[PDB]
Amino acid sequence: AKQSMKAREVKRVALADKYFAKRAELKAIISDVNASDEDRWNAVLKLQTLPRDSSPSRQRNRCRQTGRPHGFLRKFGLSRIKVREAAMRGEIPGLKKASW
Amino acid sequence: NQYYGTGRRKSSAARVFIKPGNGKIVINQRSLEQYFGRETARMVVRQPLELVDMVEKLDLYITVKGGGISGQAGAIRHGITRALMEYDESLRSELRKAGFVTRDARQVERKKVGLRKARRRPQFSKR
Protein backbone atom coordinates (compact mmCIF):
# COMPACT_ATOMS: atom_id res chain seq x y z
CA ALA A 1 0.00 0.00 0.00
CA LYS A 2 1.04 3.60 -0.58
CA GLN A 3 2.38 5.89 2.13
CA SER A 4 -0.78 8.01 1.88
CA MET A 5 -3.07 5.11 2.81
CA LYS A 6 -0.97 4.48 5.92
CA ALA A 7 -1.27 8.17 6.82
CA ARG A 8 -5.06 8.00 6.50
CA GLU A 9 -5.14 4.90 8.72
CA VAL A 10 -3.21 6.46 11.61
CA LYS A 11 -5.55 9.46 11.46
CA ARG A 12 -8.56 7.14 11.78
CA VAL A 13 -7.22 5.46 14.93
CA ALA A 14 -6.07 8.75 16.49
CA LEU A 15 -9.52 10.31 16.10
CA ALA A 16 -11.20 7.21 17.57
CA ASP A 17 -8.82 7.27 20.56
CA LYS A 18 -9.67 10.87 21.47
CA TYR A 19 -13.43 10.21 21.47
CA PHE A 20 -13.18 6.65 22.81
CA ALA A 21 -14.52 7.61 26.23
CA LYS A 22 -17.44 9.59 24.79
CA ARG A 23 -18.48 6.75 22.48
CA ALA A 24 -18.36 4.13 25.24
CA GLU A 25 -20.62 6.10 27.58
CA LEU A 26 -22.95 7.31 24.81
CA LYS A 27 -23.67 3.77 23.60
CA ALA A 28 -24.22 2.67 27.20
CA ILE A 29 -27.09 5.17 27.43
CA ILE A 30 -28.65 3.94 24.17
CA SER A 31 -29.00 0.47 25.71
CA ASP A 32 -29.21 -0.15 29.47
CA VAL A 33 -31.26 -3.28 28.64
CA ASN A 34 -34.12 -1.07 27.39
CA ALA A 35 -33.81 2.56 28.51
CA SER A 36 -35.69 5.81 27.91
CA ASP A 37 -37.42 7.07 24.75
CA GLU A 38 -36.32 10.67 24.11
CA ASP A 39 -32.93 10.41 25.85
CA ARG A 40 -32.20 7.35 23.71
CA TRP A 41 -33.11 9.18 20.49
CA ASN A 42 -30.96 12.19 21.36
CA ALA A 43 -28.00 9.90 22.04
CA VAL A 44 -28.43 8.38 18.57
CA LEU A 45 -28.41 11.83 16.96
CA LYS A 46 -25.28 12.81 18.90
CA LEU A 47 -23.40 9.76 17.61
CA GLN A 48 -24.27 10.85 14.06
CA THR A 49 -22.72 14.31 14.53
CA LEU A 50 -19.70 12.63 16.21
CA PRO A 51 -17.03 12.26 13.47
CA ARG A 52 -17.46 9.05 11.47
CA ASP A 53 -13.78 8.05 11.79
CA SER A 54 -14.12 7.92 15.59
CA SER A 55 -16.01 4.64 15.11
CA PRO A 56 -13.76 1.60 15.72
CA SER A 57 -15.39 -0.09 12.70
CA ARG A 58 -13.85 2.57 10.41
CA GLN A 59 -10.31 1.19 10.87
CA ARG A 60 -8.85 -1.39 8.49
CA ASN A 61 -6.08 -3.63 9.80
CA ARG A 62 -2.92 -2.87 7.81
CA CYS A 63 0.71 -3.97 7.99
CA ARG A 64 2.64 -1.71 10.35
CA GLN A 65 5.50 -1.49 7.81
CA THR A 66 3.73 -1.45 4.42
CA GLY A 67 0.04 -0.86 5.18
CA ARG A 68 -1.34 -3.84 3.26
CA PRO A 69 -5.10 -4.05 4.01
CA HIS A 70 -5.32 -7.77 3.18
CA GLY A 71 -3.78 -10.86 4.72
CA PHE A 72 -3.37 -9.24 8.12
CA LEU A 73 -2.70 -11.25 11.28
CA ARG A 74 -3.50 -9.99 14.78
CA LYS A 75 -0.80 -12.17 16.31
CA PHE A 76 2.74 -11.21 15.17
CA GLY A 77 1.28 -8.08 13.52
CA LEU A 78 3.31 -7.53 10.33
CA SER A 79 1.48 -9.08 7.31
CA ARG A 80 1.62 -12.31 5.32
CA ILE A 81 5.09 -12.03 3.78
CA LYS A 82 6.31 -9.70 6.55
CA VAL A 83 5.91 -12.40 9.21
CA ARG A 84 7.99 -14.79 7.09
CA GLU A 85 10.67 -12.15 6.38
CA ALA A 86 11.27 -11.48 10.07
CA ALA A 87 10.86 -15.14 11.05
CA MET A 88 13.03 -16.23 8.12
CA ARG A 89 16.00 -13.99 8.93
CA GLY A 90 15.63 -14.81 12.64
CA GLU A 91 13.86 -11.80 14.14
CA ILE A 92 10.69 -13.56 15.31
CA PRO A 93 11.40 -15.30 18.67
CA GLY A 94 10.37 -18.89 18.05
CA LEU A 95 8.95 -19.40 14.55
CA LYS A 96 10.31 -22.24 12.40
CA LYS A 97 9.14 -25.03 10.08
CA ALA A 98 6.25 -27.15 11.37
CA SER A 99 6.56 -30.89 10.74
CA TRP A 100 3.94 -32.40 13.05
CA ASN B 1 -2.11 -58.60 44.39
CA GLN B 2 -2.46 -56.01 41.62
CA TYR B 3 -1.43 -56.73 38.02
CA TYR B 4 -1.00 -53.67 35.82
CA GLY B 5 -0.98 -53.18 32.07
CA THR B 6 -1.03 -50.23 29.69
CA GLY B 7 -2.95 -50.25 26.42
CA ARG B 8 -3.21 -47.80 23.54
CA ARG B 9 -5.02 -48.05 20.20
CA LYS B 10 -5.61 -44.60 18.64
CA SER B 11 -5.76 -41.95 21.39
CA SER B 12 -7.11 -43.97 24.35
CA ALA B 13 -4.96 -45.00 27.31
CA ALA B 14 -6.30 -47.88 29.40
CA ARG B 15 -5.18 -48.92 32.89
CA VAL B 16 -5.96 -52.56 33.70
CA PHE B 17 -5.87 -54.07 37.19
CA ILE B 18 -6.26 -57.86 37.36
CA LYS B 19 -7.40 -59.70 40.49
CA PRO B 20 -9.31 -62.99 40.87
CA GLY B 21 -13.03 -63.07 41.54
CA ASN B 22 -16.23 -63.49 39.50
CA GLY B 23 -15.44 -61.64 36.26
CA LYS B 24 -17.83 -58.65 36.31
CA ILE B 25 -15.58 -56.52 34.10
CA VAL B 26 -16.03 -52.93 35.30
CA ILE B 27 -15.24 -50.17 32.79
CA ASN B 28 -15.18 -46.71 34.43
CA GLN B 29 -17.44 -47.82 37.31
CA ARG B 30 -20.15 -48.69 34.77
CA SER B 31 -20.82 -52.33 33.96
CA LEU B 32 -19.71 -54.15 30.81
CA GLU B 33 -23.04 -54.26 28.95
CA GLN B 34 -23.62 -50.60 29.84
CA TYR B 35 -20.27 -49.24 28.63
CA PHE B 36 -20.16 -51.18 25.35
CA GLY B 37 -22.92 -51.45 22.76
CA ARG B 38 -22.05 -52.80 19.30
CA GLU B 39 -21.54 -56.56 19.82
CA THR B 40 -18.19 -56.33 18.00
CA ALA B 41 -16.73 -54.11 20.74
CA ARG B 42 -17.45 -56.52 23.60
CA MET B 43 -16.15 -59.50 21.58
CA VAL B 44 -12.72 -57.95 20.97
CA VAL B 45 -12.11 -57.00 24.62
CA ARG B 46 -12.59 -60.66 25.63
CA GLN B 47 -10.45 -62.13 22.83
CA PRO B 48 -7.33 -62.83 24.97
CA LEU B 49 -9.41 -64.52 27.70
CA GLU B 50 -10.94 -67.23 25.50
CA LEU B 51 -7.53 -67.48 23.80
CA VAL B 52 -6.06 -68.58 27.15
CA ASP B 53 -7.29 -70.45 30.22
CA MET B 54 -8.58 -67.65 32.45
CA VAL B 55 -11.61 -66.85 30.28
CA GLU B 56 -13.48 -65.49 33.32
CA LYS B 57 -11.90 -67.12 36.41
CA LEU B 58 -10.18 -63.84 37.32
CA ASP B 59 -11.58 -60.30 37.13
CA LEU B 60 -10.64 -57.20 35.16
CA TYR B 61 -10.67 -53.67 36.59
CA ILE B 62 -10.50 -51.17 33.72
CA THR B 63 -10.06 -47.40 33.61
CA VAL B 64 -9.99 -45.74 30.18
CA LYS B 65 -9.89 -42.14 28.98
CA GLY B 66 -9.95 -40.49 25.57
CA GLY B 67 -10.75 -41.73 22.10
CA GLY B 68 -13.85 -43.58 20.98
CA ILE B 69 -15.31 -47.10 21.16
CA SER B 70 -12.65 -48.65 18.88
CA GLY B 71 -9.72 -46.90 20.56
CA GLN B 72 -10.97 -47.52 24.09
CA ALA B 73 -11.96 -51.13 23.41
CA GLY B 74 -8.77 -51.87 21.49
CA ALA B 75 -6.58 -50.32 24.18
CA ILE B 76 -8.34 -52.38 26.87
CA ARG B 77 -7.58 -55.54 24.87
CA HIS B 78 -3.96 -54.49 24.40
CA GLY B 79 -3.54 -53.82 28.12
CA ILE B 80 -4.93 -57.23 29.06
CA THR B 81 -2.45 -58.83 26.64
CA ARG B 82 0.64 -57.19 28.15
CA ALA B 83 -0.57 -57.74 31.72
CA LEU B 84 -1.16 -61.47 31.25
CA MET B 85 2.36 -61.78 29.85
CA GLU B 86 3.76 -60.00 32.91
CA TYR B 87 1.80 -62.40 35.13
CA ASP B 88 2.94 -65.64 33.46
CA GLU B 89 5.84 -64.80 31.08
CA SER B 90 4.62 -67.85 29.11
CA LEU B 91 1.59 -66.66 27.09
CA ARG B 92 3.85 -64.80 24.62
CA SER B 93 3.76 -67.62 22.03
CA GLU B 94 -0.01 -67.76 21.50
CA LEU B 95 -0.43 -64.02 22.09
CA ARG B 96 2.40 -63.10 19.70
CA LYS B 97 1.08 -65.39 16.97
CA ALA B 98 -2.41 -63.92 17.45
CA GLY B 99 -0.83 -60.49 16.83
CA PHE B 100 -2.06 -59.28 20.22
CA VAL B 101 1.28 -58.25 21.75
CA THR B 102 2.01 -55.84 18.89
CA ARG B 103 1.11 -52.22 19.60
CA ASP B 104 -1.14 -50.96 16.81
CA ALA B 105 0.75 -47.86 15.70
CA ARG B 106 -1.87 -46.72 13.17
CA GLN B 107 -2.92 -43.16 14.01
CA VAL B 108 -5.04 -40.53 12.30
CA GLU B 109 -2.86 -39.09 9.55
CA ARG B 110 -2.44 -35.33 9.76
CA LYS B 111 -4.04 -33.06 7.18
CA LYS B 112 -1.71 -31.71 4.51
CA VAL B 113 -1.52 -28.37 2.74
CA GLY B 114 -3.42 -28.26 -0.54
CA LEU B 115 -5.48 -31.37 0.25
CA ARG B 116 -8.86 -31.53 1.98
CA LYS B 117 -7.80 -34.57 4.04
CA ALA B 118 -4.74 -36.80 4.44
CA ARG B 119 -4.69 -38.03 0.84
CA ARG B 120 -7.81 -36.66 -0.90
CA ARG B 121 -6.98 -33.90 -3.37
CA PRO B 122 -9.34 -31.25 -4.78
CA GLN B 123 -10.97 -32.32 -8.03
CA PHE B 124 -8.54 -31.79 -10.91
CA SER B 125 -9.34 -30.49 -14.39
CA LYS B 126 -7.04 -31.47 -17.25
CA ARG B 127 -7.83 -28.38 -19.34
Binding site: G71, L73, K75, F76, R80, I81, V83, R84, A87, P93, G94, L95, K96, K97, A98, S99, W100 | V113, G114
Partner: protein
Protein backbone atom coordinates in the same frame (compact mmCIF):
# COMPACT_ATOMS: atom_id res chain seq x y z
CA UNK C 1 -0.94 -22.43 51.72
CA UNK C 2 1.69 -21.38 54.28
CA UNK C 3 2.65 -18.38 52.11
CA UNK C 4 3.93 -20.81 49.46
CA UNK C 5 4.95 -19.26 46.13
CA UNK C 6 4.74 -20.95 42.73
CA UNK C 7 7.20 -19.83 40.05
CA UNK C 8 6.26 -20.22 36.38
CA UNK C 9 8.99 -19.99 33.74
CA UNK C 10 7.79 -19.23 30.21
CA UNK C 11 10.09 -19.28 27.19
CA UNK C 12 10.07 -20.22 23.50
CA UNK C 13 12.90 -22.79 23.32
CA UNK C 14 13.37 -26.36 24.52
CA UNK C 15 16.92 -25.81 25.84
CA UNK C 16 17.15 -22.24 27.22
CA UNK C 17 14.19 -22.86 29.54
CA UNK C 18 15.66 -26.12 30.85
CA UNK C 19 19.05 -24.47 31.38
CA UNK C 20 17.44 -21.55 33.22
CA UNK C 21 15.32 -24.06 35.16
CA UNK C 22 18.45 -25.59 36.72
CA UNK C 23 19.55 -22.20 38.06
CA UNK C 24 16.21 -21.48 39.74
CA UNK C 25 16.11 -24.94 41.37
CA UNK C 26 19.80 -25.48 42.18
CA UNK C 27 19.98 -22.14 44.01
CA UNK C 28 17.10 -22.94 46.36
CA UNK C 29 18.42 -26.42 47.14
CA UNK C 30 21.95 -25.07 47.61
CA UNK C 31 20.85 -22.44 50.16
CA UNK C 32 18.65 -25.15 51.65
CA UNK C 33 15.12 -24.63 50.32
CA UNK C 34 12.65 -27.36 49.36
CA UNK C 35 11.55 -26.52 45.80
CA UNK C 36 8.94 -28.72 44.15
CA UNK C 37 10.07 -30.55 41.03
CA UNK C 38 10.13 -28.79 37.66
CA UNK C 39 6.69 -30.13 36.73
CA UNK C 40 6.26 -30.05 32.92
CA UNK C 41 3.01 -28.64 31.52
CA UNK C 42 1.75 -29.08 27.93
CA UNK C 43 3.77 -26.99 25.47
CA UNK C 44 1.16 -24.90 23.65
CA UNK C 45 1.70 -25.21 19.89
CA UNK C 46 -0.15 -22.45 18.05
CA UNK C 47 -0.31 -23.29 14.33
CA UNK C 48 -0.36 -20.69 11.55
CA UNK C 49 -0.83 -20.92 7.79
CA UNK C 50 0.13 -18.11 5.42
CA UNK C 51 0.08 -17.54 1.67
CA UNK C 52 3.71 -17.61 0.56
CA UNK C 53 2.95 -16.02 -2.81
CA UNK C 54 2.21 -12.33 -3.46
CA UNK C 55 -0.52 -13.28 -5.96
CA UNK C 56 -2.16 -16.52 -7.21
CA UNK C 57 -1.03 -20.15 -6.58
CA UNK C 58 -2.77 -20.83 -3.25
CA UNK C 59 -1.21 -24.28 -2.84
CA UNK C 60 2.28 -22.93 -2.01
CA UNK C 61 1.45 -22.46 1.67
CA UNK C 62 3.81 -22.62 4.65
CA UNK C 63 3.28 -24.05 8.14
CA UNK C 64 4.62 -22.18 11.18
CA UNK C 65 4.40 -22.99 14.87
CA UNK C 66 4.99 -21.40 18.26
CA UNK C 67 6.09 -23.75 21.03
CA UNK C 68 5.49 -22.03 24.36
CA UNK C 69 7.35 -23.94 27.05
CA UNK C 70 6.11 -23.37 30.60
CA UNK C 71 7.92 -24.95 33.52
CA UNK C 72 6.62 -24.51 37.05
CA UNK C 73 8.33 -24.83 40.43
CA UNK C 74 6.68 -24.62 43.85
CA UNK C 75 8.53 -23.68 47.03
CA UNK C 76 6.41 -24.80 49.98
CA UNK C 77 8.57 -23.18 52.66
CA UNK C 78 8.83 -19.43 51.92
CA UNK C 79 12.01 -18.70 53.85
CA UNK C 80 12.83 -14.99 53.73
CA UNK C 81 16.41 -15.36 52.46
CA UNK C 82 15.61 -17.76 49.60
CA UNK C 83 12.61 -15.70 48.47
CA UNK C 84 14.60 -12.46 48.50
CA UNK C 85 17.47 -14.21 46.72
CA UNK C 86 15.26 -15.51 43.91
CA UNK C 87 13.84 -11.99 43.52
CA UNK C 88 17.17 -10.20 43.03
CA UNK C 89 18.59 -13.19 41.11
CA UNK C 90 18.92 -12.50 37.39
CA UNK C 91 18.02 -15.20 34.88
CA UNK C 92 18.83 -15.76 31.21
CA UNK C 93 17.16 -13.11 29.08
CA UNK C 94 15.66 -15.72 26.76
CA UNK C 95 13.35 -17.12 29.42
CA UNK C 96 10.52 -15.19 31.08
CA UNK C 97 9.12 -15.65 34.57
CA UNK C 98 5.72 -14.92 36.18
CA UNK C 99 6.36 -14.82 39.93
CA UNK C 100 3.00 -15.19 41.70
CA UNK C 101 2.27 -16.60 45.14
CA UNK C 102 -1.25 -17.53 43.98
Amino acid sequence: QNQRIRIRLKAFDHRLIDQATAEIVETAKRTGAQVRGPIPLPTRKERFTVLISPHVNKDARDQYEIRTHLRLVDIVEPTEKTVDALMRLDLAAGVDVQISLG
